[PDB]
């Protein structure tokens, strides 16, 4: 279980919007937190979250320290917690926060750092990660109190030693936000840009709300011996609608499910060796031990066997088979890998070539040829890492995965038509980004689920973004539609209601001379051309009739 404390600066600056139709840094902060809470609930993650504000007027922390208010201690996300945080969103919610824990107050980070470090201890479980995410638009908190500023740097330095990590979600402030004035010696380790929009803040939060989780770790053997360890990560993973659970109607308590197979006639409970495996084909039964059903899948031992390098050109976009994985070096197992790996990534990029490997996930599983496509790192304007460095593990289909298709005749459009369509395509241009759409169904489900867990009057019918903005598209298209139809749809269209070839080839391939004389006659008969009684004759004729 990973723990995450959300630390929010409640100074007076945090409630002043930077003169735009943008939200106040406090508002941004709160909302990105409700987000991480809801994110965790969606992926049914078991992580622990906390909410802590400092610089407030009232206080609430284990040792009555001043100006520090612990709204929520480390615990799992719940409907009520989100509702609570939500009460501080928007301008009206700002007042609610102000009233309850009046902002603009004296404080010292050490005391604050301690309380958070303390919320962890209090935990009664085991924690894989301990992080503190600080939301503040104040870059030099104790520049006037050269003592607090010192206790804070120390106190921070101590947390790192305890394994607690702090990330800075610095927010906008008039003039900018100089990280080098203080937080420089406080954050754990270029850095992220300051967040002025809720859009970039969430992106920055999402990029740190979780910690690397490998799908596995394998031996990427360059050959029998030369081997490097890599971590296989699944950056894309269809989010499923979690299934319902069974409960003891009276206590609404979880119910484990045991499964016991047994022989019906002897009422005896069956053990794995009291049953064999069967399959039938017609009037033929085939029996194998369970061990054998698995035995027949075994090929390579787990890992990625190198097969060679192939120019990226040969890999085709429409040759998709299943989501791709991400390959990064795993220096922990085999030391030196990050180096070999790095060299490869550098050379594959230079040569525009991917490394072809015979991939085998776990034990007893048929191999699959994959392409390790070189992937260069990319950061955007906010310094957020858009594309990591390493290799994209791409599955290639076997012959059986391809389904060929018959075709009718090709009926190509005219340059005037392509023209009108081009115009239409541009009016409907837009920037695609992978985080563009939310899953209609998941939203609906959990939105309702929330309303219910909150005994709310009714649920919040989400807005399907996946749906096409028709009225808009229409308006933006203007007459182009009607002008396009004219170019392609007849006015009465129901929109919603021995052939020359052969013989020429035989000649090119020199198989005409292999023709029997009867075949030669019929051929000359068909072109009613002047023949003969001899073969060479018919041969000379037919060839001349075409080529000469």
């Amino acid at each position: 279980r990973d723990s995450l404390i959300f630390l929010v600066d409640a100074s007076k600056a945090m409630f002043e919007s930077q003169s735009e139709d943008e939200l106040t840094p406090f508002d941004m902060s709160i909302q990105c937190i409700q987000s991480v809470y809801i994110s965790k609930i969606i992926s049914s993650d078991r992580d622990l979250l906390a909410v802590v504000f400092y610089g407030t007027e009232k206080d609430k922390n284990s040792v009555n320290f001043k100006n520090i208010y612990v709204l929520q201690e480390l615990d799992n996300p719940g409907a009520k917690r989100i509702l609570e945080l939500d009460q501080f969103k928007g301008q009206q919610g700002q007042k609610r926060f102000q009233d309850m824990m009046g902002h603009g107050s004296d404080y010292s980070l050490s005391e604050v750092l301690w309380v958070c470090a303390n919320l962890f201890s209090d935990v009664q479980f085991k924690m894989s990660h301990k992080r503190i995410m600080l939301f503040t638009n104040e870059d030099n908190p104790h520049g006037n109190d050269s003592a607090k500023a010192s206790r804070a740097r120390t106190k921070a330095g101590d947390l790192r030693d305890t394994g607690i990590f702090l990330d800075l979600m610095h927010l906008k402030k008039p003039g900018g936000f100089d990280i080098s004035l203080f937080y420089r010696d406080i954050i754990s380790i270029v850095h992220f840009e300051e967040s002025s929009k809720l859009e970039d803040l969430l992106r920055k939060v999402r990029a740190k709300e979780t910690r690397k989780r490998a799908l596995s770790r394998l031996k990427l053997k360059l050959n029998k011996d030369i081997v490097i360890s890599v971590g296989i990560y699944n950056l894309v993973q269809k989010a499923l609608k979690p299934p319902p659970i069974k409960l003891y109607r009276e206590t609404n308590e979880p119910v484990k499910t045991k499964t016991r197979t047994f022989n019906t006639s002897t009422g005896g409970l069956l053990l794995p060796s009291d049953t064999k495996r069967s399959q039938i084909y017609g009037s033929r039964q085939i029996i194998l031990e369970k061990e054998e059903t698995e035995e027949l899948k075994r090929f390579d031992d787990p890992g990625l066997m190198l097969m060679g390098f192939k120019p990226l050109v040969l890999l085709k976009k429409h040759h998709y088979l299943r989501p791709s994985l991400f390959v990064y070096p795993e220096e922990s197992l085999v030391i030196g890998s990050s180096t070999l790996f790095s060299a490869l990534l550098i050379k594959c990029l230079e040569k525009e070539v991917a490394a072809l490997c015979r991939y085998t996930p776990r034990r007893n599983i048929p191999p699959y040829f994959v392409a390790l496509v070189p992937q260069e790192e990319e950061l955007d304007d906010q310094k957020i890492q858009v594309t990591p460095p390493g290799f994209q593990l791409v599955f290639l289909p076997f012959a059986d995965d391809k389904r060929k298709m018959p075709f009718t005749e090709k009926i190509m459009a005219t340059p005037e038509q392509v023209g009108k369509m081009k115009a239409i395509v541009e009016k409907l241009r837009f920037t695609y980004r992978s985080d563009s759409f939310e899953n209609p169904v998941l939203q609906q489900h959990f939105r309702n689920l929330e309303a219910l867990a909150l005994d709310l009057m009714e649920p919040e019918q989400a807005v399907d973004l996946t749906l096409p903005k028709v009225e808009a598209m229409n308006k933006r298209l203007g007459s182009l539609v009607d002008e396009f139809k004219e170019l392609v749809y007849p006015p009465d269209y129901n929109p919603e209601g021995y052939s020359e070839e052969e013989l020429k080839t035989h000649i090119s391939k020199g198989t005409l001379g292999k023709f029997t004389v009867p075949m030669l006659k019929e051929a000359c008969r068909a072109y009613g051309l002047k023949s003969g009684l001899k073969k060479q004759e018919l041969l000379e004729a037919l060839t001349k009739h075409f080529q000469d």
Binding site: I226, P243, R358, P389, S434, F437, E496, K514
Partner: protein, 520 residues
């Protein structure tokens, strides 16, 4: 729906000729033939199969009246294939001493189809001949042969011991190293195929070895996939009738292992009983009548006016959201487990043109369409990409599902380029540059300005099935013996050409030394 296939197998004497180390034509043919029958059997296809043999010591065929079509045997008449056919191929059937007239066999093979198909309904009649074209034959029949094949609509395929160290099924015999008789037979084979299919017909002449690493034997009998009809819509005023086909879809083991009793080997006797009880201590049992469902919401537990709150979709669709630079829709985002190819509704010239506009329009501006996809009413809507795909014979859009936000798992990773801790040396870089060069699985060969793949993994069948089938069979025929080792030709096809391994040696050695590696 149904295909009638005749496997005309050469069993003549020269088929047994064995060159040191290399499996004889007879053994290779036996392998290919079994690969075909295995598939047909464990897949449960109702395609009927007849097996003709020419070169047998005796004569057993409908046309043998009068010392003609001698040494040709119709070992198996048209009918579903069963294990009794498979056991006949391994054991039973052996190499002959005679040399039958290869075209005579063909004729006998054609006769099996013609006569034995009258009372039935087949969609395709196909013949597969495996021979080394080593002996004499009379060209006199060619006349009738061709014309009948065309009239009866019987398709054809040839599998030989060569093509137009030897590793069966690998990716590595000069037409000069074959006998002159073989050369003459090949000219008649080459002709026959040209008269039947023209140029492309020459691509219907394979070698036993390449046939092991291909599905070409099943080519003429694959069941076409049904289309998905829908309207590609742009706004609410533009509509184009389309048809979608599953271009890519992973094939999977269909049949499952049934649990039976170690002795009766029956299922009936076996029964799994799934019961429920309190999860924490004082593990009391619970009754179905007293069990409800409900989902979790964090720490909350909601007992789930209810199902009646499920997402409501307007149903089936393929509507456009917008267009955008292709570069923004990166392959590493592709999701789902299929690839659809969208064409204009069949026989709708208008639509054909409409779609063509779009397709070319996209290929030009170099953009793509982000679309909303919904298979049927009950289906979960999807958001994906539709990008142009233009070819010689056709044009279409390739649909592929894209991700929803909740599918994104964004982890940050440390730049390895700016890492002073790991940055490789110049000695190390060129070392790898050397390796990559040596292990190239491609070559700018022949048509000088052309690239040739030396390891087309997507032309190789999943080694999963042939493996499974082999085992299944070995257990059906040899119940007592333990499952056999993987067949070499299967290992040989999953490995790269021999060249690559060779050229790699030295480079690799240097890379071994230059890159230290020690387990923690």
């Amino acid at each position: 729906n149904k295909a009638a296939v005749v496997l005309c197998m050469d069993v003549g004497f020269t088929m047994s000729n064995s060159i040191p180390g290399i499996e004889s034509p007879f053994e290779q043919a036996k392998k290919v033939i079994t690969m075909f029958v295995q598939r047909q059997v464990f897949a449960e296809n109702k395609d009927e199969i007849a097996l003709v043999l020419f070169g047998t010591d005796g004569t057993d065929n409908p046309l043998s009246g009068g010392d003609q079509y001698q040494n040709i045997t119709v070992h198996r008449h048209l009918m579903l294939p069963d294990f009794d056919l498979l056991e006949d191929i391994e054991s039973k059937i052996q190499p002959g001493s005679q040399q039958a007239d290869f075209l005579d066999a063909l004729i006998v093979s054609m006769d099996v189809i013609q006569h034995e198909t009258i009372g039935k309904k087949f969609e395709k009649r196909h013949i597969e001949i495996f021979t080394d074209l080593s002996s004499r034959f009379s060209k006199s029949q060619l006349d009738i042969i061709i014309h009948s094949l065309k009239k009866c609509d019987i398709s054809l395929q040839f599998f030989l011991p060569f093509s137009l160290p030897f590793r069966l099924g690998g990716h590595g015999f000069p037409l000069k190293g074959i006998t002159e008789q073989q050369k003459e037979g090949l000219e008649i084979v080459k002709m026959v195929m040209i008269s039947l299919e023209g140029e492309d017909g020459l691509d219907e002449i394979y070698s036993f070895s390449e046939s092991l690493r291909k599905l070409c034997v099943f080519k003429k009998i694959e069941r076409h996939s049904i289309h998905w009809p829908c309207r590609l819509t742009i706004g609410s005023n533009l509509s184009i009738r389309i048809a979608a086909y599953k271009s890519i879809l992973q094939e999977r083991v269909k049949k499952t292992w049934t649990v039976v009793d170690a002795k009766t080997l029956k299922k009936e006797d076996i029964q799994k009983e799934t019961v429920y009880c309190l999860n924490d201590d004082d593990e009391t049992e619970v009754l179905k009548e007293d069990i409800i469902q409900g989902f979790r919401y964090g720490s909350d537990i909601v007992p789930f006016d209810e199902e009646q709150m499920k997402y409501k979709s307007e149903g089936k669709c393929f509507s456009v959201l917008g267009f955008c630079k292709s570069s923004q829709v990166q392959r590493r985002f592709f999701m789902g487990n299929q690839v659809l190819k969208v064409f204009a509704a069949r026989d709708d010239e208008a639509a054909a043109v409409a779609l063509s506009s779009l397709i070319h329009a996209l290929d030009d501006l170099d953009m793509v369409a982000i679309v909303r996809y919904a298979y049927d009413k009950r289906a979960n809507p999807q958001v994906g990409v539709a990008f142009p795909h233009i070819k010689h014979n056709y044009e279409c859009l390739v649909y592929v599902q894209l991700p929803f936000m909740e599918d994104l798992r964004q982890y940050m990773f440390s730049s390895l380029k700016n890492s002073k801790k790991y940055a490789p040396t110049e000695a190390q870089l060129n070392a790898v540059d050397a390796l990559i060069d040596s292990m190239s699985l491609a070559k700018k060969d022949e048509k000088t300005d052309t690239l040739e793949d030396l390891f087309p993994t997507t032309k190789i069948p999943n080694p999963r099935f042939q493996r499974l089938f082999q085992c299944l069979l070995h257990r059906a025929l040899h119940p007592r013996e333990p499952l056999p080792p993987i067949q070499q030709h299967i290992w040989n096809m999953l490995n790269p050409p021999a060249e690559v391994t060779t050229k790699s040696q030295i480079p690799l050695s240097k890379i071994k030394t230059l890159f230290p590696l020690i387990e923690a």
